[PDB]
Write a protein that binds this DNA or RNA. Structure first.
Lengths: 276, 276
DNA sequence: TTGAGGAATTTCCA
DNA sequence: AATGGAAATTCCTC
């Protein structure tokens, strides 16, 4: 529905936001999986002020993230994952030019709902812009927001319709960047703390040290553990790794980079090791 | 023609081989240009033993590079560039399920021909494998060879058919990273050699030194020439540049970075200059 | 169209 | 079914 709503006398809140990224899939591919949450779980929606003992139907559809008139995204449609097992929530498929998922919000769970039945299909830019009426374009526009709605019936006969939107979700298959290093060196034993000040640093970021021969033959590689804290979206706390040879009589130049998965390595950062 | 030939009593030789790479184009795009030669010119084909004063027709078609039964490539077709001007050779378009270009080989030029009217179209994998008969596949198979043929008529009535093939031609279309510096300093005069050990280093890589005021106003910038060798995919040989002021009575801190085009600069690398 | 360089979508694989 | 990883084929832009 293009009309905007909010959170009237009660309140519909997203208790658990979905990961910032989520590669969507095409009709040409097979499901690319449900929208997952950073916690390794799934996003969670909850209706608070409801006291009655009647189950409502939470509605889920994919909407726009940028611009600003929250509306169904023309190039994305929620996908009903048929989790023969993994699925913890029942589903239903409706329409209105855009597909909508309806999951039950039951008081049994304190009107709380785990969303692990929602995927993200991606229609083909051409196929869309090709239909009479649409003026928006797909190109470069792949940000999305999960939209949740509930239609609360009050004994008085009225219908209160709340709605909420997740944070933005990138839906396309963005690398790390280091600007400053808390420390520049340390000695063989390691231990000392190094705080990296940069960008794109996510909870899934990794830091690895490496040493190469003047040619390029990497002879050393070791992952230095990041930190227990949520760190920061632009700050990492790395515990300098130990070295492979404490018995050095001259400092040793090495490198360390930040990586986010596979094809996501930051430029090599310089770091030296002083002999005992 | 699937049948193989060679170089009988005369000889058909490629006097100038085509560059190893050449991004081909789709019917969906516009010509991506004629096949060019490393010399900046174009490939050149020549028939030697011919003495008669009659022009023959050199035939050009795109064939397979790998495997080994030199044959028309099913996913590539020569493209007749309509060089309203740049074109130095006339052309003709034939068939046989595969398109063939026929350029004239005239004695005026010593039966020599400059090939600057040949491009490389790329049919769509699906569109091909979809036709009854073909069993080969496009996927990962994008190597090609320019094939040239001549049909030499001998007064005796016979027909001698020679043929030759260019070297293989790749037909298909990420910032630098410095991990180690061979040298750390040098003095004003420069000259000394510096070997950079990193990644992504391509033949088109450049190295520039720079100096800035504590604010950021860059007052010095000079490109230090790389090296004649193919260097390495992870190793560069830079000849330290000269400095702008030999008359310094104190060392000077400067920087140097590796760049691949425009938006491809590596982090600034530290380097100092000692006074005479 | 011609002629490319540089990406962003779609399709494909293991 | 669910994804991670790429090749392919469109798309922009000048």
């Amino acid at each position: 529905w293009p009309l905007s709503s909010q959170s009237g006398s009660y309140e519909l809140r997203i208790e658990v936001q979905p990961k910032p990224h989520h590669r969507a899939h095409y009709e040409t591919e097979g499901s690319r999986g449900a929208v997952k949450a950073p916690t390794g779980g799934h996003p969670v929606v909850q209706l608070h002020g409801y006291m009655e003992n009647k189950p409502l139907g939470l509605q889920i559809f994919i909407g726009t993230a940028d611009e600003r008139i929250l509306k169904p995204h023309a190039f994305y449609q929620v996908h009903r994952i048929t989790g023969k097992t993994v699925t913890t929530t029942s589903y239903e498929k409706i329409v209105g030019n855009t597909k909508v998922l309806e999951i039950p919000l039951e008081p049994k769970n304190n009107m709380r709902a785990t969303i692990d039945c929602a995927g993200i299909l991606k229609l083909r830019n051409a196929d869309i812009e090709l239909r009479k009426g649409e003026t928006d374009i797909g190109r470069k526009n792949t940000r999305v927001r999960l939209v949740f709605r509930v239609h609360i019936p009050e004994s008085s006969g009225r219908i209160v319709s709340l709605q909420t939107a997740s944070n933005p979700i990138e839906c396309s298959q963005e690398l790390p960047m280091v600007e400053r290093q808390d420390t520049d060196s340390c000695l063989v034993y390691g231990g000392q703390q190094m705080i990296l000040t940069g960008q794109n640093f996510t909870s899934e970021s990794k830091v690895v040290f490496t040493e190469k021969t003047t040619d390029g033959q990497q002879i050393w590689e070791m992952e230095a553990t990041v930190d227990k804290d949520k760190s920061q979206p632009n700050m990492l706390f790395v515990e300098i790794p130990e070295y492979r040879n404490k018995h050095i009589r001259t400092p040793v130049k090495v490198n360390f980079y930040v990586i986010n998965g596979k094809r996501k390595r930051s430029q090599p950062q310089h770091f030296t090791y002083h002999p005992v």
